[PDB]
């Protein structure tokens, strides 16, 4: 027992991290096969970022201007192309540590692990979620750009995120590995405010099921509710609407605990209306929303 914000083991991704330098800008790249993926803003100066014309800036760059270093050894760049907001640097050597991989574009509410890197070197790993406003609440400093988000299914790493920027509000924005930003963010240093950061309701319910599985049952009440009634309360508290799809995804957790999904919704409804009253659930004084129902099942069953 015990429930922790657990990240995937990062070894498979550590073997893909490289340093990319263009001019005076150095950030991280992801080396898969003979291609190094990195944010296209590597070609920019801090001044360029105010109003960059990436196509024009890229015309002034050649293969030899992209310095790619894997460990202490230099990789030879034999091609370069811009795909949306990422650059793909074709190198003459396939990464011998390339794992089985996929590029996936995740949905808001979905969680992933981030391997924060600086100068192509991993500094740490943490678990986060794609917020409903398409930002991530990560931990990134200058130089962390190019750090990636991923999930692992046994031996296949599914890359979902590449870090590009920090908004003036301390939240983070990035792309999938095809270079498309999550949300409406652009790689330009301009006025970009995030939308409402709503709570991922299905994740909170999954975490309430994890709490019951791990012994924290004080919040279980004698009530039930309906999806419509629950959703009136969820709207009032800036919680995402709960759908029948979400109820269905919670089915295995509902079956394991013997607590019907709508009964747990009534528990959540009372927690929203009355607060925790100075009490905690799984060592937290707030309702955790960065564990999906899949994460709760995975952690409670020990999938390796």
Ligand X SMILES: CN(C)c1ccc(N(Cc2ccsc2)C(=O)Cn2nnc3ccccc32)cc1
- Please list the active-site residues: 41, 145
Q: Cα(first)–Cα(last) distance of the chain, in Å?
A: 16
For residues 61 and 97, which CB has a smaller minimum distance to ligand X in the complex? 61
The site partner of 119 among its own copies, ligand X, none (C-beta below 5 to 8 Å per kind) is its own copies
Contacting positions for its own copies (CB under 8 A): 1-12, 14-15, 115-119, 121-126, 128, 137-141, 143-144, 166, 170-172, 214-215, 275-276, 278, 280, 283-286, 298-304
- Whose Cβ is closer to its own copies: residue 53's or residue 142's? 142
Minimum separation from the CB atom of position 66 to its own copies (A): 21
Work out how close the CB of 277 gets to its own copies at its nearest, in angstroms, rounded to a whole number: 11
| DSSP per-residue string spanning 103-155 | E--PPTT-EEEEEEEETTEEEEEEEEE--TTS-B-----TT-TT-EEEEEETT
Angle at 110 between CA 149 and CA 295, to 5 degrees: 95
| SS3 call for 59 | helix
255 binds, among its own copies, ligand X, none (CB under 5 to 8 A by kind): none
d(CA 214, CA 283): 11
Q: Are strands 77-83 and 86-91 parallel, antiparallel or unpaired?
A: antiparallel
> Which residues make up the interface to ligand X (CB under 6 A)?
1, 25, 41, 44-46, 49, 140-142, 144-145, 165-166, 187-189
Cβ nearer to ligand X, comparing 25 with 198: 25
Q: How far is the CB of 288 from its own copies (least distance, A)?
A: 10
Q: How far are the Cα atoms of 17, 67, 237, 276 from residue 85, in angstroms, in the given order?
A: 19, 19, 35, 43
Q: Which does 41 bind (CB under 5 to 8 A by kind): ligand X, its own copies, none?
A: ligand X
Residue 145 contact among its own copies, ligand X, none, beta carbon within 5 to 8 Å by kind: ligand X
Q: Looking up tokens 């391997």, which residue turns up?
A: 115
């Amino acid at each position: 027992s015990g429930f922790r914000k657990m990240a995937f083991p990062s070894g498979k991704v550590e073997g893909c991290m490289v340093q990319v330098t263009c001019g005076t800008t150095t950030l991280n790249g992801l080396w898969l096969d003979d291609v190094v993926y990195c944010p296209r803003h590597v070609i920019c100066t801090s001044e360029d970022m105010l109003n960059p014309n990436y196509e024009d800036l890229l015309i002034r760059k050649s293969n030899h201007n992209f310095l790619v270093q894997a460990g202490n050894v230099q990789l030879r760049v034999i091609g370069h192309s811009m795909q949306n907001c990422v650059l793909k640097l074709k190198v003459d050597t396939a990464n011998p540590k390339t794992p089985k991989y996929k590029f996936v574009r995740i949905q808001p509410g979905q969680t992933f692990s981030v391997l924060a890197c600086y100068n192509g070197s991993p500094s740490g790993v943490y678990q986060c979620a794609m917020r409903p406003n398409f930002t991530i609440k990560g931990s990134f400093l200058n130089g962390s750009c190019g750090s990636v988000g991923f999930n692992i299914d046994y031996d296949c790493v599914s890359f979902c995120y590449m870090h590009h920027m920090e908004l003036p509000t301390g939240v983070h924005a990035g792309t999938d590995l095809e270079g498309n930003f999550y949300g409406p963010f652009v790689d330009r240093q301009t006025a970009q405010a995030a939308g409402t950061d709503t709570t991922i309701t299905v994740n909170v319910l999954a975490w309430l099921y994890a709490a019951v599985i791990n012994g924290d049952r004080w919040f279980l009440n004698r009530f039930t509710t309906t999806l419509n009634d629950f959703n009136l309360v969820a709207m009032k508290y800036n919680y995402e609407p709960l759908t029948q799809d979400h109820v269905d995804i919670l089915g295995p957790l509902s079956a394991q605990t013997g607590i019907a999904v709508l009964d747990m919704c009534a528990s959540l409804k009372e927690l929203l209306q009355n607060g925790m009253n100075g009490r905690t659930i799984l060592g937290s004084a707030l309702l955790e929303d960065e564990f999906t129902p899949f994460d709760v099942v995975r952690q409670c069953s020990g999938v390796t």
